[PDB]
């Protein structure tokens, strides 16, 4: 209509403080409220909030200015946080690794982050696939007995065995050990050519559950493979479960129950499968579960972990069909619990071309959160014009085109008379420069 | 293997009260644990509980014994139980409908239920799908930039505004506008939805859309849920390919909050209190859902005491309307916001028309019914005659009973039917219990 339309359309797009939209958000600000002493460690709160329309993965890490800037621990260093959800409120751990003490001024006062939320897109997993075994003369003994009935869209299976369990000890459990034990039953009317996963429906024994499965076709059979977490394992157990077709592209080498929670649409959460104390004299510890999963490069797998103050876990791409093992580092003044099933983070998946491998590097790895890094550097680093966002923790970058589109709000509060706003990429990254953080105790627990 | 193995593998099999496995349960109890005047309600304990390995729609029925039984009010009623999830604790509302009070051990104190898991397959639905329009003025300017794996629109406009009153919302009113802007490089025939992103103001959502494809120009309807609508809006939006089978006419927001992998909970639009003076209230949104035949609807209500609400299918295309009745000794409130129950899918097949009724239909929570009838048009099926539908007890989800320690009885026992698809658990007890403050 008139010009006065034209301003108003002009200020509704590109925002303010208070609400702005693009797909990185750049936060340059200055420590205050308090000092940080040199081995110290304090919760920066850096005063904004991020929000999104579709639940997503909102990270917040330090930034990398330059794509020769190392993931070295720097002098104020702040871990990388990563929240699943449609909204955020950047609070993070500032550690001072450095020599000297922080002063309310000087040089050393500001740091610099770059927020971004990464799409959740549905990406199916078979938890019980069925792979092929490899053993020939003589098979299984067909030691189970199994009704087999065909439902509208599923076979069901209702199954008697009298397993033979065998106790198989391991320190990486709370209870130190897990009785496992197999058979077989014959396939029967059961298409092994068509069927590719099972789920297990009900058991006469609460603490049994189906591990993992394989199938022969040349010999018709099904192995069941068990687990019980009890010290008495049952004499006999029924079964009751369903063959069916998923044609899942990421699969599980065994079933996620119990250490990895199923999530909706897409990945799991990982649980402590054992309870252990960070101390200063042991500061480390090494969660590590029987279990990977094959995406055939179809997605990348990337662990997020929580976000549990003065503690340090490993992030990003884990590699398919070796072992999920996360390292747990102390970076803080204080001993740290971590209690048996208490989440240590998220796996999520993420289709093929959503990450690309940084062209310099050889693989995509994961690493400390206290080293998590975010760079907005041209695709002209695709030898060695347009800004990408690239995790040199990761040796990974995506394309600003394929993150989910931030709504930031930077609360009154942290704003000064010197603080502005830039832009660049006709509004897709925004930076939010000379606005004020304040420094809060660690909490108690 | 040896006689041994055959008696515990048979044991673990067929189960105990502690344990036992089936596609429908019945419970037969005794109600007990005090007195029930005639025209009360009471709280009904079934001490028993339920689980499935599967996020499941747990129900819990008052049994109808015969395929010629009415969906009536019984002297002694049990309300229907629905509960979404992997584990349920029955407790039912027990109405002292009829005449006389109930005192221990009167006469007829046995009530008999059933109960099943009805599966929740994954089902898509399209919150903004692209409908067809029906008849210019590309009144907003839009940016349309093609990312790896949709169209993404940034669009600004000076819309105008029109408030519309509407008393079945809290805040009486609603702001609305629309307009359109141009196609441009989006192919109209193939993309069918859009996602709402980013918008410059937070009250302010996309409702609808249409398309054109002979000027290929989009149509957006906003809403404005605040006493000042924006001048000038900013939007960052998706247009993609969904392929759903089921779409929603409207946005399901803000009444359908959306729920992950089926269905929607439906979110009460205006707090209202029902009294003895108004003991009824009709919730009804500006929303339906279109499946083509290809999915059932049926709506599952909060388990609120007092309260009867409206239970089963929805016919498509129709405004999703559903009564509530007191049926309580008490008045009781309902806020604005506040869940009033569950929409989700069923793939088509699961329910079937009973053979010899009109169409499948909703019944009030009070007069929900489950029998177990042979296929009439030789096996059991599991038949809703408050819904007129049946499915297979095939397609049910194999439920995990643990009849309570203290609910047995020296004479409770147990029965099976359909090569234990059908357990029965026979002579236990229901404590009673009084219905809790508002």
Not at 104 to 109: A, D, F
Not at 401 to 413: K, M, R, Y
């Amino acid at each position: 209509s008139s010009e006065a339309a034209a301003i108003s359309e002009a200020e509704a797009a590109s925002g303010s403080f208070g609400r702005l939209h693009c797909q990185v958000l750049r936060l340059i600000t200055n420590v205050e409220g308090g000092s940080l002493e040199a081995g110290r460690l304090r919760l920066l709160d850096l005063r904004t909030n991020i929000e999104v329309s579709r639940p997503s993965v909102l990270c917040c890490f330090q930034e990398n200015k330059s794509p020769h800037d190392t993931v070295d621990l720097t002098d104020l260093n702040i871990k990388g946080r990563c929240v699943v959800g449609e909204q955020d409120r950047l609070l993070v751990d500032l550690n001072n690794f450095g020599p000297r003490r922080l002063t309310p001024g000087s040089e050393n006062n500001t740091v610099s982050v770059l927020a971004f939320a990464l799409p959740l897109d549905r990406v199916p997993v078979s938890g019980l696939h069925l792979f092929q075994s490899q053993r020939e003369e003589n098979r299984p003994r067909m030691e189970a007995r199994a009704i087999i009935r065909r439902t509208a869209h599923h076979w069901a299976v209702r199954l008697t065995v009298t397993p033979n369990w065998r106790r198989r000890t391991d320190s990486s459990l709370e209870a130190g050990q897990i009785f496992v034990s197999q058979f077989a039953f014959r396939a029967g009317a059961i298409p092994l050519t068509l069927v590719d996963a099972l789920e297990q429906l009900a058991c006469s024994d609460p603490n049994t559950y189906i591990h993992k499965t394989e199938t022969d076709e040349r010999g018709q059979w099904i192995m069941l493979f068990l687990h019980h977490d009890s010290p008495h394992p049952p004499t006999s157990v029924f079964l009751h479960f369903s063959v069916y077709t998923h044609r899942a592209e990421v699969v599980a080498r065994h079933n996620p129950y119990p250490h990895l929670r199923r999530l909706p649409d897409n990945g799991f959460q990982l649980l402590i499968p054992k309870s252990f104390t960070l101390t200063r004299i042991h500061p480390e510890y090494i969660v590590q579960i029987q279990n990977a999963f094959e995406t055939n490069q179809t997605h990348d797998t990337i662990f997020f972990p929580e976000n549990i103050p003065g503690v340090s876990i490993e992030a990003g791409p884990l590699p398919d069909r070796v072992r999920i093992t996360l390292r747990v580092t102390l970076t803080g003044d204080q001993a740290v619990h971590l209690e048996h099933r208490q989440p240590l983070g998220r796996i999520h998946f993420f289709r093929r071309g959503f990450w690309t491998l940084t062209p310099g590097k050889p693989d995509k790895i994961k690493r400390p959160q206290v080293q998590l890094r975010a760079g907005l550097f041209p695709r002209s680093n695709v030898m060695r014009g347009a800004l990408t966002l690239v995790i040199p923790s990761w040796h990974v970058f995506a394309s600003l085109d394929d993150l989910v589109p931030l709504t930031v709000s930077v609360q009154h509060a942290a704003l000064r008379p010197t603080s502005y706003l830039r832009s660049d990429m006709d509004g897709d990254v925004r930076t939010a420069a000379d606005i004020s953080s304040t420094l809060r105790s660690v909490p108690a627990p």
